[PDB]
Design an enzyme around this catalytic site. Structure first.
Site, PDB file in Angstrom:
ATOM      1  N   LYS A  67       0.574  -1.185  -0.218  1.00  0.00           N
ATOM      2  CA  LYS A  67      -0.055   0.044   0.055  1.00  0.00           C
ATOM      3  C   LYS A  67       0.706   1.258   0.323  1.00  0.00           C
ATOM      4  O   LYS A  67       0.398   2.347  -0.810  1.00  0.00           O
ATOM      5  CB  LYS A  67      -1.283  -0.048   1.646  1.00  0.00           C
TER       6      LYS A  67
ATOM      7  N   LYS B  21      13.212  -1.662   1.319  1.00  0.00           N
ATOM      8  CA  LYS B  21      11.478  -1.868   1.239  1.00  0.00           C
ATOM      9  C   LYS B  21      11.644  -0.057   1.695  1.00  0.00           C
ATOM     10  O   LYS B  21      12.521   0.785   2.041  1.00  0.00           O
ATOM     11  CB  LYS B  21      11.133  -1.898   2.537  1.00  0.00           C
ATOM     12  CG  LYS B  21       9.447  -1.372   2.722  1.00  0.00           C
ATOM     13  CD  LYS B  21       8.730  -2.461   3.205  1.00  0.00           C
ATOM     14  CE  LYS B  21       7.755  -1.663   4.032  1.00  0.00           C
ATOM     15  NZ  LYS B  21       6.594  -2.114   3.171  1.00  0.00           N
TER      16      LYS B  21
ATOM     17  N   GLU C 211      17.585  -6.864   6.234  1.00  0.00           N
ATOM     18  CA  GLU C 211      18.094  -8.787   5.885  1.00  0.00           C
ATOM     19  C   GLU C 211      17.649  -9.477   4.919  1.00  0.00           C
ATOM     20  O   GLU C 211      16.782  -9.080   4.860  1.00  0.00           O
ATOM     21  CB  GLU C 211      18.062  -9.359   7.137  1.00  0.00           C
ATOM     22  CG  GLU C 211      18.406 -10.426   7.484  1.00  0.00           C
ATOM     23  CD  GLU C 211      18.284 -11.287   8.672  1.00  0.00           C
ATOM     24  OE1 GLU C 211      18.108 -10.198   9.736  1.00  0.00           O
ATOM     25  OE2 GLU C 211      19.360 -12.308   8.768  1.00  0.00           O
ATOM     26  N   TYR C 212      18.212  -9.953   3.896  1.00  0.00           N
ATOM     27  CA  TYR C 212      17.072 -10.431   2.944  1.00  0.00           C
ATOM     28  C   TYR C 212      17.711 -11.770   3.281  1.00  0.00           C
ATOM     29  O   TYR C 212      18.944 -12.324   4.146  1.00  0.00           O
ATOM     30  CB  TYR C 212      17.997 -10.653   1.816  1.00  0.00           C
ATOM     31  CG  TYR C 212      17.459 -11.854   0.468  1.00  0.00           C
ATOM     32  CD1 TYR C 212      16.652 -11.870   0.535  1.00  0.00           C
ATOM     33  CD2 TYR C 212      18.562 -12.572   0.099  1.00  0.00           C
ATOM     34  CE1 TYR C 212      16.340 -12.132  -0.652  1.00  0.00           C
ATOM     35  CE2 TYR C 212      18.291 -13.573  -0.518  1.00  0.00           C
ATOM     36  CZ  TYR C 212      16.583 -13.594  -1.206  1.00  0.00           C
ATOM     37  OH  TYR C 212      16.152 -14.528  -2.037  1.00  0.00           O
ATOM     38  N   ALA C 213      16.067 -12.656   3.997  1.00  0.00           N
ATOM     39  CA  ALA C 213      16.040 -14.400   4.139  1.00  0.00           C
ATOM     40  C   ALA C 213      15.495 -14.647   3.268  1.00  0.00           C
ATOM     41  O   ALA C 213      14.441 -14.667   1.906  1.00  0.00           O
ATOM     42  CB  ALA C 213      14.541 -13.948   4.738  1.00  0.00           C
TER      43      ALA C 213
ATOM     44  N   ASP D  28       0.181  -9.184  17.104  1.00  0.00           N
ATOM     45  CA  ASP D  28      -0.188 -10.150  16.778  1.00  0.00           C
ATOM     46  C   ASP D  28       0.791 -10.371  15.890  1.00  0.00           C
ATOM     47  O   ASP D  28       1.717 -10.135  14.844  1.00  0.00           O
ATOM     48  CB  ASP D  28      -1.083 -10.206  16.171  1.00  0.00           C
ATOM     49  CG  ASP D  28      -2.030  -9.523  15.078  1.00  0.00           C
ATOM     50  OD1 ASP D  28      -1.694  -7.704  15.173  1.00  0.00           O
ATOM     51  OD2 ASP D  28      -1.551 -10.106  13.581  1.00  0.00           O
TER      52      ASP D  28
ATOM     53  N   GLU E 271       3.029 -15.413   7.176  1.00  0.00           N
ATOM     54  CA  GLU E 271       3.230 -14.237   6.026  1.00  0.00           C
ATOM     55  C   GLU E 271       4.113 -13.078   6.854  1.00  0.00           C
ATOM     56  O   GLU E 271       5.543 -12.989   5.785  1.00  0.00           O
ATOM     57  CB  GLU E 271       1.884 -13.591   5.489  1.00  0.00           C
ATOM     58  CG  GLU E 271       1.874 -12.075   6.070  1.00  0.00           C
ATOM     59  CD  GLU E 271       0.768 -11.192   5.099  1.00  0.00           C
ATOM     60  OE1 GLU E 271       0.743 -11.338   3.695  1.00  0.00           O
ATOM     61  OE2 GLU E 271      -0.510 -10.743   5.539  1.00  0.00           O
ATOM     62  N   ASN E 272       4.504 -12.696   8.366  1.00  0.00           N
ATOM     63  CA  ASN E 272       5.596 -12.339   8.625  1.00  0.00           C
ATOM     64  C   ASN E 272       6.569 -12.648   9.357  1.00  0.00           C
ATOM     65  O   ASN E 272       7.534 -12.488   9.727  1.00  0.00           O
ATOM     66  CB  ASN E 272       4.670 -11.053   9.407  1.00  0.00           C
ATOM     67  CG  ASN E 272       3.930 -10.157   8.708  1.00  0.00           C
ATOM     68  OD1 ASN E 272       4.109  -9.782   7.665  1.00  0.00           O
ATOM     69  ND2 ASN E 272       3.298  -9.796   8.986  1.00  0.00           N
TER      70      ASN E 272
ATOM     71  N   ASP F 143       7.740  -8.366  10.612  1.00  0.00           N
ATOM     72  CA  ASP F 143       6.628  -6.892   9.876  1.00  0.00           C
ATOM     73  C   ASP F 143       6.802  -5.872  11.191  1.00  0.00           C
ATOM     74  O   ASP F 143       8.406  -5.677  11.120  1.00  0.00           O
ATOM     75  CB  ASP F 143       5.299  -7.564  11.266  1.00  0.00           C
ATOM     76  CG  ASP F 143       5.788  -8.210  12.265  1.00  0.00           C
ATOM     77  OD1 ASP F 143       6.555  -7.506  13.289  1.00  0.00           O
ATOM     78  OD2 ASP F 143       4.274  -9.237  12.888  1.00  0.00           O
TER      79      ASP F 143
HETATM   80  C1  LIG Z   1      12.024  -8.095   3.396  1.00  0.00           C
HETATM   81  C2  LIG Z   1      12.528  -9.635   3.057  1.00  0.00           C
HETATM   82  C3  LIG Z   1      11.883 -10.628   1.829  1.00  0.00           C
HETATM   83  C4  LIG Z   1      13.447 -11.064   1.741  1.00  0.00           C
HETATM   84  N1  LIG Z   1      12.671 -13.136   1.307  1.00  0.00           N
HETATM   85  C5  LIG Z   1      12.476 -13.019   0.434  1.00  0.00           C
HETATM   86  C6  LIG Z   1      12.656 -14.656  -0.787  1.00  0.00           C
HETATM   87  C7  LIG Z   1      12.285 -14.907  -1.074  1.00  0.00           C
HETATM   88  C8  LIG Z   1      10.806 -14.805  -1.870  1.00  0.00           C
HETATM   89  F1  LIG Z   1       9.565 -15.159  -2.599  1.00  0.00           F
HETATM   90  C9  LIG Z   1      10.202 -13.580  -0.546  1.00  0.00           C
HETATM   91  C10 LIG Z   1       9.134 -12.461  -1.342  1.00  0.00           C
HETATM   92  C11 LIG Z   1       8.041 -13.273  -0.149  1.00  0.00           C
HETATM   93  C12 LIG Z   1       7.649 -14.901  -0.137  1.00  0.00           C
HETATM   94  O1  LIG Z   1       6.663 -15.256  -1.083  1.00  0.00           O
HETATM   95  O2  LIG Z   1       8.333 -15.770   0.384  1.00  0.00           O
HETATM   96  C13 LIG Z   1       8.441 -13.227   1.720  1.00  0.00           C
HETATM   97  C14 LIG Z   1       7.865 -11.690   1.704  1.00  0.00           C
HETATM   98  N2  LIG Z   1       6.681 -10.776   1.218  1.00  0.00           N
HETATM   99  C15 LIG Z   1       6.395  -9.484   2.142  1.00  0.00           C
HETATM  100  C16 LIG Z   1       7.294  -9.316   3.498  1.00  0.00           C
HETATM  101  C17 LIG Z   1       6.568  -9.610   4.438  1.00  0.00           C
HETATM  102  C18 LIG Z   1       7.181  -9.513   5.499  1.00  0.00           C
HETATM  103  C19 LIG Z   1       7.981  -8.090   5.676  1.00  0.00           C
HETATM  104  C20 LIG Z   1       8.701  -8.279   4.493  1.00  0.00           C
HETATM  105 CL1  LIG Z   1       9.560  -6.552   5.098  1.00  0.00          CL
HETATM  106  C21 LIG Z   1       8.248  -8.424   3.478  1.00  0.00           C
HETATM  107  F2  LIG Z   1       8.857  -7.731   2.268  1.00  0.00           F
HETATM  108  C22 LIG Z   1       6.398 -11.080   0.194  1.00  0.00           C
HETATM  109  C23 LIG Z   1       5.357 -10.486  -0.011  1.00  0.00           C
HETATM  110  C24 LIG Z   1       7.318 -12.475  -0.161  1.00  0.00           C
HETATM  111  N3  LIG Z   1      10.597 -12.824   0.222  1.00  0.00           N
HETATM  112  N4  LIG Z   1      13.772 -10.854   2.528  1.00  0.00           N
HETATM  113  N5  LIG Z   1      13.985  -9.975   3.762  1.00  0.00           N
END
Ligand SMILES: Cc1cc(Nc2ccc(F)c(C[C@@]3(C(=O)O)CCN(Cc4cccc(Cl)c4F)[C@H](C)C3)n2)n[nH]1
Ligand SMILES: Cc1cc(Nc2ccc(F)c(C[C@@]3(C(=O)O)CCN(Cc4cccc(Cl)c4F)[C@H](C)C3)n2)n[nH]1
Lengths: 250, 250
Positions: free
Chosen positions: B16, B35, B84-86, B129, B133-134, B147
């Site tokens: 948003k 972000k 951080e990238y996860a 909470d 997804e977070n 989050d």
């Molecule tokens: C900030 C960040 C993303 C990351 N790793 C990563 C790796 C693969 C991948 F596909 C994605 C995309 C997501 C997924 O489907 O797994 C996971 C993150 N959410 C957004 C999201 C949710 C909560 C906080 C933040 Cl800050 C945020 F961005 C979207 C909707 C889907 N992320 N490391 N650090």
């Protein structure tokens, strides 16, 4: 309604958002009070939308012990509230004049306040804390509540985050207790020289009565000043209290 | 820090206020996530000052199970968060892939979350909470809370109006209960086809377990999903739970 419809008299209070004046409708000669609020000052404090809501609720409350809001209007810069004029002013000034009130005057005031609060409960309208500066007196000596304090993903939320405000209706029961003590004693029960000491006295519910406070008044005040909001009585229990029914004129 | 310091990769989410991208610092080649938040969209929702506060708290949290905020910067129109990238993404995607988690994987995740929550408790930092997804996964499979949900006249006020937020620290205990059930079962415990039915199931705390959920897991979930927040266990009691100590790898 427009400003030109009113003759302005003396000021009746100066505030942060605006001022209050005695006024009279030019045509009908009806005496009232006009409160002016500046739109930009409201918007700066983020209370503009909050005012709109309280003013909307206040518009539909008709009770002898609630200060009447006959209407409201606005121009490009200000909001105007057309209010009832209570000729005898604030109960706080009367308390300063008399030092303390007798049991009949106190019980009658409590009755009027609980009646106004019960009328609002039936309309699912809730009130916040009550201060004596926000209680005005009509010509026939009726007390009037005169403040602007009226109120009316899921899978992961706890019950406390979905259920809403649980005991906000119980804040005014504590207020009746504080006011009943203040009216009889001449000072609020948790008064102290420092903020920290006043904070401690309220949190620990540390209050005592001077020897002149009668047993019936002590019983009602002790039931109202409960730390736990759910343990405070319902408004009907206050109106049916034997000290209230023995001493109240209403 | 400035945008020019980073090479931008693929989007990792569209929101948003703004979007998230994989990025790399041009000079060090360090992989991270950026972000972007639009100042005007934040100001329109009245969350601008709320972001400043959470970002300030998030800056000083260093834990293996909290998604790191390395820093932040801004230009005239946008706020940028260096995160951080996860690499293994959200735990929600892993739950969809596996259908449900075994007891070892679930107990280890709960341990990591309670550890992150305990670290924050010691810094007087509270969390709201928790949604799957977070929750993101590091390369070594460590869960990461990702989050922006971290938190850190008198005479007439009741104790509930002066004491402040009493059991906000107990919202995340309910979240651990919901998540532990979701991880083992594959669906949240109060799930229903309508909002009203989901609302009723949460408020009445109506949940049951499929036959495969073991007694130890049932005991922990039942202690976490208490209607009354003060009856939910302390985080130390979760970390010392016999089902947790028998099944967790951490
Ligand atoms: C900030 C960040 C993303 C990351 N790793 C990563 C790796 C693969 C991948 F596909 C994605 C995309 C997501 C997924 O489907 O797994 C996971 C993150 N959410 C957004 C999201 C949710 C909560 C906080 C933040 Cl800050 C945020 F961005 C979207 C909707 C889907 N992320 N490391 N650090
Ligand atoms: C709105 C209104 C005033 C009135 N009667 C009246 C008569 C004599 C007199 F002196 C005064 C002035 C006061 C006093 O000293 O008694 C009482 C009112 N407060 C302000 C004030 C407090 C709460 C709500 C409102 Cl709206 C408000 F204006 C000021 C500070 C002092 N008022 N009828 N209707």
């Amino acid at each position: 309604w427009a400003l030109e419809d009113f003759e302005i008299g003396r000021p009746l209070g100066k505030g942060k958002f605006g001022n209050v004046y005695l006024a009279r409708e030019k045509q009908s000669k009806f005496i009232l009070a006009l409160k002016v609020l500046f739109k930009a000052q409201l918007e700066k404090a983020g209370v503009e939308h909050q005012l709109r809501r309280e003013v909307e609720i206040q518009s539909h409350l008709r009770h002898p012990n609630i200060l009447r809001l006959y209407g409201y209007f606005h121009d490009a810069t200000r909001v105007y509230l057309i209010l009832e004029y209570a000729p005898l002013g604030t109960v706080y000034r009367e308390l300063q004049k008399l030092s303390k009130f007798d049991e009949q005057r106190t019980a009658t005031y409590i009755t009027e306040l609980a009646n106004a609060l019960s009328y609002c409960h039936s309309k699912r309208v809730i009130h916040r804390d009550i201060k004596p500066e926000n209680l005005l007196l009509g010509s026939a000596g009726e007390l009037k509540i005169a403040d602007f304090g009226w109120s009316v993903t899921l899978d992961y939320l706890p019950p406390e985050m979905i259920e809403g405000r649980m005991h906000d209706e119980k804040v005014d029961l504590w207020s009746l207790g504080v006011l009943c003590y203040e009216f009889l004693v001449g000072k609020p029960p948790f008064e102290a020289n420092t903020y920290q000491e006043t904070y401690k006295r309220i949190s620990r519910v540390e209050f005592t009565f001077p020897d002149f406070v009668t047993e019936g008044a002590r019983d009602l005040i002790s039931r109202l000043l409960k730390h736990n909001p759910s343990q405070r009585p319902m408004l009907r229990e206050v109106l049916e209290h034997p000290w209230i029914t023995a001493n109240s004129s209403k």
